[PDB]
Design a protein around this ligand. Structure first.
Ligand SMILES: Nc1ncnc2c1ncn2[C@@H]1O[C@H](COP(=O)(O)OP(=O)(O)OP(=O)(O)O)[C@@H](O)[C@H]1O
Ligand SMILES: Nc1ncnc2c1ncn2[C@@H]1O[C@H](COP(=O)(O)OP(=O)(O)OP(=O)(O)O)[C@@H](O)[C@H]1O
Lengths: 569, 361, 341
């Protein structure tokens, strides 16, 4: 039947999904989102067996999130799957509008949500959304305010100038009084310490909505930068604090404000963080800020353009057009950078998602070999790992020092079952004298290993902190290994904060300073006392955090301020 | 195979590091100090050597009875070894990982509270008791009916804040070939003192607490050594011992340990055991299992089984669904299982009523 | 490849087999070999250092006392006593009259493991085992339920208190290792029959004493209670007289189920004779009514032994069919046996 003649066998006539699994033949599925409309009765198990048919497959019914697409069809059918019942619609609708940080779903879906008229926008825009879920988070929290932060205010300024600002960022939220302490302090301009502070400036009021994006970007031009730690911090602010803007003013405002400061940016330190204010909110955004930021490429420095052009060019958009990276490869390369091209095929391989094209894209497998690490990292997103054969074959077959890069692929595929394999493998990589594979190991576990806790983790923390080695890798190992006990959970409700106080209080008796101990004591309570956000994963809907992969790629060769740029978190 | 490939490929650096320190054999105990440079040392080889030390180790760090490494060629001291005692009996004594959280309590309030403040609060807020001291108590004693022996300790396991504690089984103290218990009881104390406030708990002290004397023949002599060496090492003045104590048994016997405890111990509590209004609490914990019909009354069933502690009513909830599987019922109706519950209390009371109250009486 | 031709030159040719004493966080391990020798071994290969743990056997390369590979060798005294197997041809279908008795224990032993779907969804979980007993000398008839259990999963039978108290102890440690070895073979069934620890009169060889016997039994309870092990190693206890055992043993186990063995009636005894004589050939004149009427309070093995002696006597005449006169004359032999003293 499927060989040459006719078409549409009993498979459309009979109703068997078991043979419908076998009805399809190898073809691109981006078009296969369509089916005969049957009753919601046959549509429910139709969609279940189609789903479980489609999970192995790169593309899943969850595609409505990532894709792009972007046509009005998935919003129409997306609000029609709960059509027409508006009462029991409470789930998949309210949780979807209040669980959305960005404006696109509530926007296209806003035009696709025909319940009432013009007053559905009250449950939209994430004002009452983030307000309600934020007060239920206060219902399920919370973090200490007066005791810790004022007892720390007796200690005046810590020497790290590093991790202390993001405290008042995620903590408060929303209150003004500590916001003028944030600001008025960071007017001194010291280092990049302004970072988490001005991040609390707009994160406070923007916790619900909108907010602060009026005075959020004023310090940008207010503060030539001449570098990121000065006028680029607040320049990052409105871009990352955006989280759904656009709206649409914040788009043209960010593009405008960065087109103001160009030679002083210049191509390097701030251009790292700007595309994060666009691509997050919209992938198929019509605005091209890549070209205008890519005219500055002429500085010719191969070094800073590694970590610069990496997520500089990857962070503009998800694209999906196959054309974009061809453009930017030809106009960028020209030639070639002999270096960036690595990251550019990495950006291509990024553009599409898990198409299975990546295992065909690793055949190069350069002496650079960073193609293979991120190529297998992102190149397969699938529930079943199945990547153990190659993920182990590339470390067993691979050239030296590439195994340093190898554990970094533990970020994506490990979301399923990290407990067995991660502390297994990396447990051997942990006591290795190499600070690079110790650092990239404790990160390799890192956040994906912070999903849940265990007695093996807390018991293992011992003598991880008894080592006599110097350098930040020690308390990144141990102190990052502290944040894996729980995430945004507590303290009232639930786990006591006294034990952390005693652990970070006793370990800090050493060195004596060694200011990195006054950096670690705040490091664990970034995520520890931050709270107010549950993750979970981020995320449960199967998106991904964009600041985490980006930032965690730079300190792999961690040197000076890259760790604080990553400390935006 | 890849991990074993990289595992076997590190032997090239390992053999270069194999030249030094591999002659460190063996471990040797020192004896006396005649002067500063020269020390007499004994080894298990039976040859006692008087020898100096390496210049990389401060001589003030070596104290009598410290085991140290040796370069057999020169016999000089190489590196000291902190661990000394003991073989596998210690590692068997150590326990780790939590279980049985506080939500597993059967309604006991004053009990669990008064024992919470003896152990958990002193190590939770040490500065508090030191400020307002006075001084925290030494420890407690548990005993009585079986429900619920020994599970209350599991609560301290899950509620342990940071450093794990060690549990000990009673009958392993007494052993054939008398004189093994002497080493046994002694070593764990030093281990505990290195363990900075770690807890040591002996179960069923009545086995090793046989008191007091009989005509002949001993008999209790090998027993009395165990208990009395215990109490003597417990009554030492240094520290002693900061590791606190924890004790549990069945009957209050015998008199010798019972007369020795109130000087060194305090807070003896008795079970309690389910109160009438408290019996339902065990039903509230077991209600999360299976499915409870909204018409089931726990207070009605609870009065029909006095003195059953928590075990027997656990078997009540158990036989509900057990006999429901045989009758294919998915949920257990209140009238269905009670017909087998009066039977399961009476039929098991027919041969024996389980008179733990009579065991010590 | 090249690693196999490399590491072999380091360990060989001669090497010694020592024991691990203690491990140091410096990757220096202290080994002990015959006789009374110590050392610092640091090797990064083949380890497996975390799974070793002190108290296990390690190799020693002559130069210098290095451990190339790990060795777990059993053998061992206790591991020999669990196997094998039997997997006996007998089944629970070869016994009758205990259907009302057997239904619950057969259910209880197949409750976990096999047929888990109705067990796991119900959330009951009573994994404390079962307790058996009966009169007058039965308990092997309850073992006739263990043969069916031997057909499923893993089985181990440890019977008699002589194995502990025959010499000085060290008390339960012999049982303590049975728990853990059964944990390595989990799931497995551990059956204990005829517990005389409190019913014995004279200890074997020279050992003491009555109260130390009790303390090894009590430590058996705490092992069995227990804190803290969830593993099975399902445990079954059985004896002739339950009154000897202390009520201190019942709350930890078995709190859910204990069975009593009743004496068989006329219908049951008829079934029993049926099952044994199924394979045997009997004369036409043998009737099953008068046989069970003449017998009073007899178990399956009694009617078994009378048939065995009937066939033994029939071997004197070399006859495979047992006549009723030969059967009754043979029956009178065991009848006179129990009635002689
Ligand atoms: N009041 C109660 N609350 C909660 N659980 C209970 C209670 N009484 C009994 N139990 C449960 O019954 C189980 C059986 O108790 P167990 O037999 O371990 O006591 P025991 O240790 O034998 O007592 P003893 O040590 O005094 O002989 C325990 O696991 C316990 O959790
Ligand atoms: N209803 C029955 N059907 C078939 N066989 C039975 C039945 N009842 C008992 N038997 C058999 O009778 C035997 C009775 O064993 P018996 O009680 O004589 O052993 P025992 O010698 O007393 O064991 P121990 O000395 O260890 O107590 C069992 O092996 C069982 O197979």
């Amino acid at each position: 039947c499927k060989d040459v003649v006719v078409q549409k066998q009993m498979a459309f006539m009979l109703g068997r999904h078991g043979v419908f699994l076998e009805l399809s033949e190898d073809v691109e599925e981006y078009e296969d989102l369509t089916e005969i409309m049957s009753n919601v009765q046959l549509n429910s198990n139709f969609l279940a067996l189609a789903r479980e048919l489609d999970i192995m497959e790169p593309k899943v019914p969850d595609d409505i999130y990532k894709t792009h697409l972007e046509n009005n069809r998935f919003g129409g059918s997306g609000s029609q799957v709960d059509s027409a019942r508006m009462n029991l619609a409470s789930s998949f609708v309210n949780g979807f509008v209040n669980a959305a940080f960005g404006q696109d779903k509530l926007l296209t879906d806003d035009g696709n949500k025909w319940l009432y008229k013009n007053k559905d926008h009250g449950m939209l825009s994430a004002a009452a959304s983030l307000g309600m879920i934020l007060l239920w988070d206060v219902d399920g929290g919370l973090t200490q305010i007066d005791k810790y932060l004022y007892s720390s205010e007796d200690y005046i300024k810590s020497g790290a100038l590093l991790a202390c600002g993001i405290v008042n960022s995620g903590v408060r939220n929303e209150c003004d009084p500590a916001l003028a302490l944030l600001s008025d302090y960071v007017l001194h301009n010291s280092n990049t310490m302004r970072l988490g502070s001005i991040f609390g400036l707009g994160l406070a009021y923007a916790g619900s909505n909108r907010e602060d994006v009026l005075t959020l970007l004023l310090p940008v031009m207010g503060d030539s930068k001449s570098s990121m730690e000065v006028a680029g911090v607040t320049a990052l602010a409105c871009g990352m604090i955006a989280v759904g803007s656009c709206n649409g003013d914040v788009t043209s405002t960010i593009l405008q404000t960065i087109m103001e400061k160009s030679e002083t940016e210049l191509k390097d330190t701030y251009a790292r963080w700007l595309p994060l204010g666009l691509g997050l909110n919209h992938l198929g955004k019509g605005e091209a800020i890549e070209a205008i930021l890519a005219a500055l490429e002429v500085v010719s420095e191969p070094f800073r353009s590694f970590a610069n052009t990496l997520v500089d060019v990857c962070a503009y958009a998800g694209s999906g057009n196959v054309l974009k990276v061809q453009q930017l490869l030809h106009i960028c390369s020209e030639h070639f950078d002999s270096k960036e091209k690595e990251e550019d095929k990495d950006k291509k391989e990024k553009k599409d998602k898990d198409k299975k094209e990546a295992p065909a894209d690793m055949g190069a497998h350069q002496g650079v070999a960073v193609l293979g690490i991120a190529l297998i990292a992102m190149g397969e997103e699938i529930g079943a790992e199945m990547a153990l054969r190659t993920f182990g074959h590339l470390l067993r077959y691979g050239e030296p020092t590439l195994r340093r890069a190898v554990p970094l692929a533990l970020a994506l595929i490990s979301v399923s079952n990290p407990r067995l394999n991660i502390l297994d493998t990396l447990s051997k990589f942990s006591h290795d004298a190499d600070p690079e594979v110790s650092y990239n190991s404790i990160f390799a576990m890192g956040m994906v290993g912070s999903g849940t806790n265990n007695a093996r983790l807390a018991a293992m923390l011992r003598q991880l902190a008894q080592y006599h080695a110097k350098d930040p890798n020690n308390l990144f190992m141990v102190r990052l290994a502290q944040g894996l006990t729980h995430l945004g959970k507590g303290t009232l409700t639930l786990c006591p904060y006294h034990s952390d106080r005693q652990l970070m209080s006793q370990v800090a008796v050493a060195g004596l300073l060694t200011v990195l101990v006054s950096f670690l004591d705040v490091r664990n309570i970034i995520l520890g006392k931050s709270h107010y956000v549950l993750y979970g994963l981020v995320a449960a809907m199967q998106p991904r955090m964009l600041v985490t992969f980006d930032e965690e790629l730079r300190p792999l060769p961690v040197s000076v301020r890259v760790g604080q740029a990553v400390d935006v978190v | 195979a890849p991990p074993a490939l990289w595992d076997l490929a590190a032997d090239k650096q390992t053999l270069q590091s194999e030249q030094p320190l591999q002659v460190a054999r063996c471990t040797k105990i020192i004896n006396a100090d005649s002067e500063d440079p020269k020390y007499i040392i004994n080894v298990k080889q039976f040859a006692k050597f008087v020898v100096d030390l390496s210049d990389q180790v401060a001589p003030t760090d070596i104290e009598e009875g410290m085991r140290v490494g040796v370069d057999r060629n020169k016999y000089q001291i190489h590196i000291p070894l902190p661990p000394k005692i003991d073989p596998t009996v210690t590692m068997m004594q150590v326990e780790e990982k939590p279980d049985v959280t506080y939500s597993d309590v059967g309604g006991c309030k004053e009990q669990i509270e008064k024992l919470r403040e003896v152990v958990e609060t002193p190590l939770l807020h040490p500065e508090r008791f030191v400020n307002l001291g006075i001084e925290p108590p030494k420890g407690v004693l548990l005993f009585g009916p079986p429900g619920t022996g020994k599970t209350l300790c599991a609560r301290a396991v899950a509620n342990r804040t940071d450093a794990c504690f060690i549990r000990v089984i009673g009958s392993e103290l007494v052993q054939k070939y008398v004189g093994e218990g002497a080493r046994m009881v002694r070593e764990l104390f030093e281990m505990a003192r290195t363990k900075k406030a770690c807890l040591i708990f002996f179960d069923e002290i009545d086995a090793i607490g046989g008191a007091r004397f009989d005509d002949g023949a001993g008999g209790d002599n090998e027993v009395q050594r165990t208990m009395l060496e215990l109490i003597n090492q417990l009554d030492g003045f240094d520290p002693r011992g900061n590791i606190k104590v924890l004790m549990a048994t069945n009957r209050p016997d015998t008199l010798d340990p019972a007369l020795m405890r109130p000087g060194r111990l305090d807070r003896k509590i008795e079970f309690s055991l389910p109160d009438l209004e408290g019996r339902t609490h065990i039903f509230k914990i077991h209600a999360r299992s299976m499915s409870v019909e909204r018409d089931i009354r726990f207070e009605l069933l609870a009065r029909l089984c006095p003195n059953s502690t928590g075990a027997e009513i656990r078997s009540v909830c158990t036989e509900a669904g057990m006999f429901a599987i045989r009758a294919r019922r998915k949920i257990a109706t209140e009238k269905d299982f009670l017909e087998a519950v009066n039977k399961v209390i009476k039929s098991y009371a027919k041969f024996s009523a389980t008179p733990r109250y009579m065991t010590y009486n | 490849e090249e690693e196999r031709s490399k590491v072999d030159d380091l360990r060989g040719t001669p090497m010694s087999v020592g024991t691990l004493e203690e491990i140091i966080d410096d990757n220096h391990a202290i080994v002990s070999t015959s006789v009374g020798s110590e050392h610092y071994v640091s090797i990064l290969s083949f380890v497996d250092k975390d799974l070793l743990e002190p108290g296990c056997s390690v190799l020693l390369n002559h130069k210098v006392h290095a451990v190339i590979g790990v060795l777990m060798d059993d053998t061992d005294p206790l591991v020999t006593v669990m196997k094998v197997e039997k997997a006996p041809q007998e089944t629970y279908a070869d016994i009758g009259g205990l259907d009302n008795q057997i239904q619950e224990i057969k259910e209880s032993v197949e409750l976990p493991l096999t047929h888990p779907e109705y067990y796991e969804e119900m959330g009951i979980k009573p994994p404390k085992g079962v307790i058996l007993y009966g009169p007058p000398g039965t308990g092997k008839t309850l073992l006739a339920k263990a043969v069916a259990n031997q057909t499923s999963a893993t089985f181990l039978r440890v019977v008699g208190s002589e194995l502990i108290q025959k010499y000085l102890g060290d008390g339960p440690k012999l049982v303590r290792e049975l728990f853990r070895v059964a944990e390595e073979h989990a799931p497995s069934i551990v059956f204990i029959d005829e517990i005389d620890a409190i019913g014995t009169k004279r200890y074997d060889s020279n050992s003491g004493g009555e109260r130390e016997i009790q303390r090894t039994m009590l430590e058996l309870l705490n092992q069995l209670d227990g804190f803290d092990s969830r593993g099975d190693v399902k445990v079954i206890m059985a004896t002739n007289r339950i009154e000897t055992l202390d009520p201190a043993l019942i709350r930890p186990g078995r709190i859910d189920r204990k069975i009593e063995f009743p004496l068989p009636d006329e219908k049951t005894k008829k079934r029993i004779f049926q099952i044994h004589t199924s394979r045997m050939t009997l004369a036409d004149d043998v009737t099953l009514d008068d046989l069970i009427m003449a017998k009073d309070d007899l178990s399956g093995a009694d009617i078994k032994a009378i048939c065995t002696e009937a066939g033994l006597m029939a071997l004197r005449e070399r006859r495979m069919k047992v006549t009723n006169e030969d059967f009754k004359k043979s029956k009178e032999n065991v009848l006179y046996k129990k009635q002689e003293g």
